[PDB]
Design a protein around this ligand. Structure first.
Ligand SMILES: Oc1ccc(/C=C/c2cc(O)cc(O)c2)cc1
Length: 276
């Protein structure tokens, strides 16, 4: 599938840089014809077939195909796609309140109400995705953006679909692998992967929201991965002494090694800590 090959600078003006990663940079932009504002994600293309720099066409097209499908208040929306010899440029909805990761650095720990206010929106977004058989595979606070961080109950949107896959056969067997602190044991063990892997990541996020601490984080990446596989975490009293047993129950039913025994997204929405 080919994308718009006119110069993006003919149609948009860029501004503040919002972030950058290994193969991409995101810049605020403004569409000339409407004055409306977006985030432009420039993804570096692979320059040869056998290279390891840049992102393969197959991987770019999968991300674009998934983004084109989704429209939901808690997921980012794709506006347009451009490309040139060096980059594919996603014109994405602008979400200007920053990462949930940076928001948590400020408060350093949330109440259960503040945590469930965020979590309910994350769960609603993931329920939408899983209903479409889309696994995100990279859920973490860096990939949750706030619309406005200066309100009491910030609204969020899930971003960064670069690892997302359609799961039409119940599982994918692809060596998909994200951030060690958040990946499920089946990712660590290179096993077939399904929607269940996102539910583990939600359990990790929930633990972090409530405590300010990461449940499996070791001193090195290999230690973190070994801890995940062994389900080596505990609810430290110093962090969780005033946290309800029902919140711990929610986490405990997500941080389950066997994916078939883990809570599904529907289970999480009916769990008594969440369900109204
Ligand atoms: O597949 C995707 C890949 C990356 C993104 C990132 C979007 C994004 C949008 C913003 O408004 C601000 C931002 O800092 C990031 C969204 C989807």
């Amino acid at each position: 599938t080919v994308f718009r090959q006119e110069n993006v600078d003919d149609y948009y003006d860029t501004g503040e840089e919002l972030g950058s990663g290994q193969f991409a940079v995101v810049k605020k932009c403004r569409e000339k014809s409407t004055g409306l504002q977006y985030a432009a994600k420039f993804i570096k293309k692979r320059r040869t077939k056998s290279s390891r720099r840049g992102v393969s066409r197959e991987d770019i097209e999968r991300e674009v195909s998934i983004l084109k499908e989704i429209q939901h208040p808690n997921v980012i929306t794709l506006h347009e796609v451009y490309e040139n010899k060096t980059d594919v440029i996603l014109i994405l909805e602008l979400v200007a309140g920053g990462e949930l990761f940076d928001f948590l650095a400020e408060k350093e720990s949330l109440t259960e109400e503040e945590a469930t206010e965020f979590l309910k929106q994350i769960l609603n977004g993931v329920y939408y995705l899983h209903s479409l058989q889309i696994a995100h595979f990279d859920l973490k606070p860096e990939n949750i953006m706030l619309l406005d961080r200066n309100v009491p109950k910030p609204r969020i949107k899930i971003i960064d679909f670069g690892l997302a896959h359609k799961i039409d056969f119940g599982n994918e067997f692809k060596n998909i692998f994200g951030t060690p602190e958040f990946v499920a044991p089946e990712i660590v063990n290179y096993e077939p992967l399904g929607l269940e892997a996102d539910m583990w990541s939600i359990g990790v996020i929930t633990y972090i929201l409530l405590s300010g601490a990461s449940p499996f984080l070791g001193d090195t990446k290999q230690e973190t991965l070994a801890n995940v596989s062994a389900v080596n975490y505990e609810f430290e009293d110093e962090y969780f002494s005033n946290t309800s047993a029902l919140a711990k129950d929610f986490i405990r039913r997500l941080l389950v090694k066997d994916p078939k025994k883990r809570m599904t997204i529907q289970d999480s929405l009916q769990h008594p800590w969440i369900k109204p």
